[PDB]
Amino acid sequence: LNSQFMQVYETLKSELIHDPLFEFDDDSRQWVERMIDYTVPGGKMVRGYSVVDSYQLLKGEELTDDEIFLSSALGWCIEWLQAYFLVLDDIMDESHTRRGQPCWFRLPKVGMIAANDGILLRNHVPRILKKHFRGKPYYVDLVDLFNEVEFQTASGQMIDLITTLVGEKDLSKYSLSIHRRIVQYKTAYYSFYLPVACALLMFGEDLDKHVEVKNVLVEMGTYFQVQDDYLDCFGAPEVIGKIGTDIEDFKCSWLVVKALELANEEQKKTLHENYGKKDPASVAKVKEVYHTLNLQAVFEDYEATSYKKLITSIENHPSKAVQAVLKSFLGKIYKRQK
Amino acid sequence: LNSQFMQVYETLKSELIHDPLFEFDDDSRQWVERMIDYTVPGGKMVRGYSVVDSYQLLKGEELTDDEIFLSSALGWCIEWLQAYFLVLDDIMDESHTRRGQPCWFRLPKVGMIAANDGILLRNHVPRILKKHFRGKPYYVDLVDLFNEVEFQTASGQMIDLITTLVKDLSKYSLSIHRRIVQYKTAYYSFYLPVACALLMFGEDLDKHVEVKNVLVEMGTYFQVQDDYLDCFGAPEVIGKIGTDIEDFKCSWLVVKALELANEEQKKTLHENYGKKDPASVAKVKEVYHTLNLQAVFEDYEATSYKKLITSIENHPSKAVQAVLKSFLGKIYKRQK
């Protein structure tokens, strides 16, 4: 159902740039169409896809043309929402590239106009919801759902920024609790809960009755980001497709907060003196501390322990349909190498 | 009701920093509370308060404490929404001060974090709506209303940005100016507050396209007045020195000048519009004076007022006429 998913993108984009709520001309229609094409469909679309996959698993049989369109539409709302956050994040972080191209705000003719473009993208989400879902009994739930997850994501970004940018760098500002809070609100609600929540609402379910599903997905999304933190330092560049810079970038990574928790006082001193320095020798001393502390084994331990909990929680769920949704998510990330 | 209005702000801000949807701690609660106080309540609050006034005028009687709270809360949603756009506008335009203080993004401990704070402010609007209106039969209409007007406003800002920033004056035109002021300002400044009051009053907005058209027209007129005052208004009254000519703004003045200018006049405008040089700024104003744009604005004002007064007095509802006449009287022949 890939070609169709992409076809749904083309239809939604075409609808957006002929939106009756706004008086377009040639230049403004061109501006938005190009902005959408640049910022929205350039990724792997895993979150988007997941709506269609999860919905298929809920039904148990093949989808109608309408179910494929509707599930893909919600998938795209998620991708639109992510694109908006990423456009702004690139601005705040002074990034240079994303998805193999200059960041939107880096183009000569875009500049800080990118900030309002990101805002436009966010507003595209209710336009899509209104066009195709306004007659559904669960319309209000979808609208509330997207606002709430957007709120949680913004709040997660907020604590990430103030933890890692406000004031002096001070590695003691970092901790496991803060790391969890950041990862949970910033990524886990929109990446893992949102897709399944979309599928559930479309299936006719009541989210008030699926808190269990939400809690598992949040846990899973937390595990997912720990894996990412780990891979940034220990994954092979030939496999993960980048050279990690979390150490240089003074990131609140699971690795540094774990190391801080395990270190003695010379190691803690080494960390404080070398973490966040763009220097290859300082980076090496950090990685050396991680090796000495055996962080690989600690992570393998965490991963083994997290997997069993998730599996246990999933199997304990009364719905077999839900289990198949959850196990599919757990399966796409467990022991991944990128 | 002014004192109750500010009390509502305190209640709303308190709810927002104890929101069970987010896991606040002391640091993040202090961050958000300070950010709200800095960015939201520092203005004149005309738009926010106009929801309370409008609802009052619809009712034709004293308000209950609940009506005072609900209409203020909607008023504050509008001020929160505006505050979010202004935080972002300051960043994009690289401004230095606003409301008598450095722009939020200019503070050394804030910087570009201001961008995500603006986003947080936007997300506070549905938090407020849901907390206080979830059980109202017009809840979905409120949420849709705010989403729609946010969309229009961001689209208006979009054409404002691309018209001015991406260079010749020939691209400027009367219809582009209309589109900019309509979408960027008129819907959130004039329609939105009345739409809020109407929904609270039990009305169906599908039945009020006429109210919408009038308010959008009134908002367009408001912006033209604003463009006029930027160049011809008294700084001693306006409280600033206009720089629209320097800023290369698609002002109503410049597009009217272009509509009327000869080849000599047009070449001068093309030569000097958008120059910081006070010599070039004064060259533009002289053209404006030669074409008698004062009398042209005077004619547009008198014509606009008569049309608006006419549409208002045709309205089937005398309570709605009171709402509309109050907005008109708030802006007619204003000097700032």
Write the layout of secondary structure elements.
Two copies of one chain form a homodimer.
Chain A: H1 2-16, H2 26-39, H3 46-59, H4 65-92, E1 97-98, E2 101-102, H5 113-133, H6 139-164, H7 176-203, H8 211-234, H9 237-240, H10 254-262, H11 265-274, H12 280-292, H13 295-315, H14 320-333
Antiparallel strand pairs in A: 1-2
Keywords:
homodimer; globular; metal-binding (chain B); two-stranded antiparallel ribbon; 338 residues; EC 2.5.1.1 (chain B); mainly alpha
Over the alpha carbons, how many angstroms does the gyration radius of chain A reach?
A: 21 Å
Question: Percentage of helical residues of chain A?
Answer: over 70%
How many runs of DSSP E, i.e. beta strands of chain A? 2
- Tell me the strand order in the biggest sheet of chain A: 1-2
Binding site for isopentenyl diphosphate (chain B): 82, 99
Binding site for Mg(2+) 1 (chain B): 89, 93
Catalytic activity (chain B): isopentenyl diphosphate + (2E)-geranyl diphosphate = (2E,6E)-farnesyl diphosphate + diphosphate; isopentenyl diphosphate + dimethylallyl diphosphate = (2E)-geranyl diphosphate + diphosphate
Organism (chain B): Artemisia spiciformis
Report what the structure shows.
2 copies of one chain form a homodimer. Chain A is mostly helical. Chain A has one domain: Farnesyl Diphosphate Synthase. Chain A is 71% helix and 1% strand. A two-stranded antiparallel ribbon of chain A has the order 1-2. In chain A, strand 1 and strand 2 form a beta hairpin. In chain A, helix 4 packs antiparallel against helix 7. The two termini of chain A are 24 Å apart. The interface between A and B is large, with 49 and 48 residues. Chain B: This is Farnesyl diphosphate synthase 1. Chain B: Belongs to the FPP/GGPP synthase family. Chain B: GO terms for molecular function: (2E,6E)-farnesyl diphosphate synthase activity; dimethylallyltranstransferase activity; metal ion binding. Chain B: Keywords: Isoprene biosynthesis, Magnesium, Metal-binding, Transferase.
